[PDB]
Structure 1
Amino acid sequence: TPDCVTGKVEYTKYNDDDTFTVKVGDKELATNRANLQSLLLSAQITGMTVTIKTNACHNGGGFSEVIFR
């Protein structure tokens, strides 16, 4: 799966449908994997660099793959 955006998490958002949005770089991307919520908030709090891989690389696009560095 290709890299879409790499960077620090600017903000996260919990959605009415239980999905979770993350803003990294110039894109807001959303995931339906509940296990990733606490992991992503942890990366945001600690300032980790994350890479989000997705073929839906556009604002509002979905993802499931994330590299935490």
Structure 2
Amino acid sequence: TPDCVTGKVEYTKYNDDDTFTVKVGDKELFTNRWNLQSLLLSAQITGMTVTIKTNACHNGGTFSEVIFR
């Protein structure tokens, strides 16, 4: 899957539909994977660099693959 954005997690958002948004690089993207919520907030808090890979690489686009570096 192509890299979409890489960078520290700028901010995150818990959404009303229970999905979870991250702003990384130039994009907000959201995931419907419950498991990723804790992981991504941890990554935000600790300032980890993450790479979000998705074919739907647009603002508001969906993702389910993350590399934590």
TM-score (norm 2): 0.99
1:16 and 1:48 map into 2 onto residues whose CA distance is 26
1:53 and 1:40 map into 2 onto residues whose CA distance is 14
- SS of the aligned residue for 1:4 comes to strand
Tell me the CA shift for residue 29 of structure 1. 0.2
Tell me the CA shift for residue 12 of structure 1. 0.2
Runs of 4+ aligned structure 1 residues displaced above 6 Å come to none
Residue number in structure 1 paired with 2:34:
34
- SS of the aligned residue for 1:67 comes to strand
Identity %: 96
Tell me the CA shift for residue 17 of structure 1. 0.1
Task: Give ranges in structure 1 of 5+ residues lacking alignment.
Answer: none
- SS of the aligned residue for 1:28 comes to strand
2:56 and 2:21 map into 1 onto residues whose CA distance is 14
TM-score (norm 1): 0.99
